[PDB]
């Protein structure tokens, strides 16, 4: 999906409920910012690719990282240790494949 495989119906931790939510904002050098609602185990790839498709840019041309770590296809807010309304850093190249 990005670096490895990633698929829906991902297994959660178990105790974490649905009565909890977290929002995240993705920002890019293009001054673009998007605030989305996610849960603990939301694949951020879906958010990022949604922005990529919306902006019409290839996912291999752009890169999403937080605290110097790339947001992998299976990376989540719980996994990366983020908070609500936090910010993810994104850069986009103009050419790729």
From Swiss-Prot:
PTM note: Cleavage of precursor form by SENP1 or SENP2 is necessary for function.
Cross-link (Glycyl lysine isopeptide (Gly-Lys) (interchain with K-? in acceptor proteins)): 97
Native source species: Homo sapiens
PROSITE patterns reported for this sequence: UBIQUITIN_2
Family: Belongs to the ubiquitin family. SUMO subfamily.
Name by which UniProt lists this protein: Small ubiquitin-related modifier 1
GO annotation, biological process: cellular response to cadmium ion; cellular response to heat; DNA repair; negative regulation of action potential; negative regulation of delayed rectifier potassium channel activity; negative regulation of DNA binding; negative regulation of DNA-binding transcription factor activity; negative regulation of DNA-templated transcription
Keywords, ordered alphabetically: Acetylation, Cell membrane, Chromosomal rearrangement, Cytoplasm, Host-virus interaction, Isopeptide bond, Membrane, Nucleus, Phosphoprotein, Ubl conjugation, Ubl conjugation pathway
Modified positions (N-acetylserine) in chain numbering: 2
Site keyed Interaction with PIAS2: positions: 36
SMART domains the record matches: UBQ
Cross-link entry Glycyl lysine isopeptide (Lys-Gly) (interchain with G-Cter in SUMO2), positions: 7, 16-17, 23, 37, 39, 45-46
Subcellular location: Nucleus membrane; Nucleus speckle; Cytoplasm; Nucleus, PML body
Domain of life: Eukaryota
Membrane keyword on record: yes
One Gene Ontology MF term: RNA binding
Subunit structure: Covalently attached to KCNB1; UBE2I increases cross-linking with KCNB1 and PIAS1 decreases cross-links with KCNB1. Interacts with SAE2, RANBP2, PIAS1 and PIAS2. Interacts with PRKN. Covalently attached to a number of proteins such as IKFZ1, PML, RANGAP1, HIPK2, SP100, p53, p73-alpha, MDM2, JUN, DNMT3B and TDG. Also interacts with HIF1A, HIPK2, HIPK3, CHD3, EXOSC9, RAD51 and RAD52. Interacts with USP25 (via ts SIM domain); the interaction weakly sumoylates USP25. Interacts with SIMC1, CASP8AP2, RNF111 and SOBP (via SIM domains). Interacts with BHLHE40/DEC1. Interacts with RWDD3. (Microbial infection) Interacts with Epstein-barr virus BGLF4.
Function: Ubiquitin-like protein that can be covalently attached to proteins as a monomer or a lysine-linked polymer. Covalent attachment via an isopeptide bond to its substrates requires prior activation by the E1 complex SAE1-SAE2 and linkage to the E2 enzyme UBE2I, and can be promoted by E3 ligases such as PIAS1-4, RANBP2 or CBX4. This post-translational modification on lysine residues of proteins plays a crucial role in a number of cellular processes such as nuclear transport, DNA replication and repair, mitosis and signal transduction.
Effect ascribed to mutating residue 97 to A: Abolishes sumoylation of ZBED1
One Pfam family cited in the UniProt record for this chain: Rad60-SLD
Record cross-link Glycyl lysine isopeptide (Lys-Gly) (interchain with G-Cter in SUMO1), residues: 7, 25
GO cellular component: cytosol; glutamatergic synapse; nuclear body; nuclear membrane; nuclear pore; nuclear speck; nuclear stress granule; nucleolus
Domain Ubiquitin-like: 20-97
Gene: SUMO1
Ranges for region (Microbial infection) Interaction with Tula hantavirus: 16-25, 37-40
